[PDB]
Amino acid sequence: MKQFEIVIEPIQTEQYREFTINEYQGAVVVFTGHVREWTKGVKTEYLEYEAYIPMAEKKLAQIGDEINEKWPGTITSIVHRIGPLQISDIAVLIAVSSPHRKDAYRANEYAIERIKEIVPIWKKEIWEDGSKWQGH
Amino acid sequence: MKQFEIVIEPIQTEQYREFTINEYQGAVVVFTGHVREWTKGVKTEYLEYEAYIPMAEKKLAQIGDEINEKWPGTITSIVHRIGPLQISDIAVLIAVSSPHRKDAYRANEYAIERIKEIVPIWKKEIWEDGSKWQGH
Amino acid sequence: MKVLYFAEIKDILQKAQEDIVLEQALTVQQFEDLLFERYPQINNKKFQVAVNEEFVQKSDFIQPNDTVALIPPVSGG
Amino acid sequence: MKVLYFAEIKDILQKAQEDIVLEQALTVQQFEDLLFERYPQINNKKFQVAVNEEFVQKSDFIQPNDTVALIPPVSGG
Ligand SMILES: Nc1nc2c(c(=O)[nH]1)N[C@H]1C(=O)[C@H]3OP(=O)(O)OC[C@H]3O[C@H]1N2
Numbered sequence: 001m002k003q004f005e006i007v008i009e010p011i012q013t014e015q016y017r018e019f020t021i022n023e024y025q026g027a028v029v030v031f032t033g034h035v036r037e038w039t040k041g042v043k044t045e046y047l048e049y050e051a052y053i054p055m056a057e058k059k060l061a062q063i064g065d066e067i068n069e070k071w072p073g074t075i076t077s078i079v080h081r082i083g084p085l086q087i088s089d090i091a092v093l094i095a096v097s098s099p100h101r102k103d104a105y106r107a108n109e110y111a112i113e114r115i116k117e118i119v120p121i122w123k124k125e126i127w128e129d130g131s132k133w134q135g136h
Numbered sequence: 137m138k139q140f141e142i143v144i145e146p147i148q149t150e151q152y153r154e155f156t157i158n159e160y161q162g163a164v165v166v167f168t169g170h171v172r173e174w175t176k177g178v179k180t181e182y183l184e185y186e187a188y189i190p191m192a193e194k195k196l197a198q199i200g201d202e203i204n205e206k207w208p209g210t211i212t213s214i215v216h217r218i219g220p221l222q223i224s225d226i227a228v229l230i231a232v233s234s235p236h237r238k239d240a241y242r243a244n245e246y247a248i249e250r251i252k253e254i255v256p257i258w259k260k261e262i263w264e265d266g267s268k269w270q271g272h
Numbered sequence: 273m274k275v276l277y278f279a280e281i282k283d284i285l286q287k288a289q290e291d292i293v294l295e296q297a298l299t300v301q302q303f304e305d306l307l308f309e310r311y312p313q314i315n316n317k318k319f320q321v322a323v324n325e326e327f328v329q330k331s332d333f334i335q336p337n338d339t340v341a342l343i344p345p346v347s348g349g
Numbered sequence: 350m351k352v353l354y355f356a357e358i359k360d361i362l363q364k365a366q367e368d369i370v371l372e373q374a375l376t377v378q379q380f381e382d383l384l385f386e387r388y389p390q391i392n393n394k395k396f397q398v399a400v401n402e403e404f405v406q407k408s409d410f411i412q413p414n415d416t417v418a419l420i421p422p423v424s425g426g
């Protein structure tokens with residue numbers, strides 16, 4: 001298990017909490033992004049994720065550095081899955097430990113916003129009658 | 137597992153995430169509170185939580201309701217441990233799922249705030265020189 | 273009436289609970305007066321009172337068969 | 350120079366990489382220019398360019414040996 005990783009296997013979640021804990025930390029926040037079935041109108045069959053892997057892994061490492069700078073005392077771990085994901089599968093997991101609770105919440109929310117901004121990962125939404133790569 | 141529970145036994149964590157998941161939920165945020173050895177120079181040997189169990193369980197469910205009120209679509213689960221707790225042991229876990237990520241983070245952070253405010257639970261800091269019950 | 277004690281008050285009073293017989297109902301205020309005349313060593317300690325697992329005001333009433341709980345400043349999480 | 354395509358561009362172009370011989374170093378802008386002439390069918394698609402796994406300005410140079418990736422709007426998480 002790397003601190004920052006792109007994987008093809010289902011994400012084993014609890015080991016990421018463990019990585020971030022030590023005696024100085026009193027808080028851990030874990031965020032998991034799951035595939036939703038319904039509603040921008042027509043039901044999602046599944047999601048296909050792909051990545052430019054080495055650079056994607058680097059950009060995740062970079063977000064960890066930004067978090068260390070902005071919130072010292074934190075430890076961050078991030079993993080993203082690729083390939084076809086089913087309804088409710090974990091696409092992404094972010095774990096941030098910290099001495100006190102607020103930094104953990106802040107750094108964790110920072111991470112997910114930065115992933116959506118700078119990491120070369122792309123999702124394709126497939127449904128019965130078609131499919132389309134997403135932007136933003 | 138109860139959705140809102142006080143436990144003596146070590147908290148087993150993955151199940152609380154799983155309780156909150158369904159096809160509508162895009163994000164789960166889980167907060168764990170861990171016993172800290174060092175607090176800005178000060179050394180903790182161990183902690184000792186006690187509680188007014190039936191009231192504390194009522195009050196935790198009341199927070200679930202408040203969250204459902206303020207962030208419709210959320211599912212929430214909360215467990216708090218009592219008794220003597222060692223360094224890095226999980227004293228509290230808070231799991232919130234929501235269709236969207238912002239509600240998940242907001243709702244989780246509200247929950248921990250409210251627990252510190254209303255729920256009848258008390259921690260006793262033990263150090264090598266003595267001990268003391270904490271206030272706010 | 274079952275009185276319950278927790279945290280520092282449990283420690284001071286050297287007891288976890290007790291039963292006080294009440295002939296008639298009385299206000300939370302009158303209950304505190306009773307408690308402090310019995311236990312001057314806790315007359316300077318902060319707490320809220322819970323009657324049957326809900327927080328109450330000083331003008332609220334305690335019945336003889338009620339359960340009452342002295343809730344010192346909470347410190348959960 | 351190794352060129353890497355992803356997402357919608359990978360699908361339009363039916364391929365994930367190709368090799369393109371550059372006589373000399375080109376600015377990012379010139380390379381996009383070359384790409385649109387070579388591939389009319391993607392000149393309405395938005396992308397940044399990454400050289401050796403780094404984002405770059407349009408006036409930065411691509412060396413003949415560099416690896417160049419077309420990064421469409423990202424949709425991770
Ligand atoms: N030794 C020691 N460890 C602690 C706490 C504490 O009060 N003493 N608070 C617990 C909390 O409720 C949270 O408080 P906090 O200040 O939000 O920091 C994170 C958590 O740390 C926990 N770990």
Ligand SMILES: Nc1nc2c(c(=O)[nH]1)N[C@H]1C(=O)[C@H]3OP(=O)(O)OC[C@H]3O[C@H]1N2
Nearest residue numbers: 033034035036162163235236237425426
């Ligand atoms: N079907 C589907 N599932 C998804 C996302 C999505 O866009 N479509 N966004 C992913 C995210 O990155 C997070 O953003 P979000 O959409 O704000 O909600 C939580 C997460 O849901 C995730 N799961």
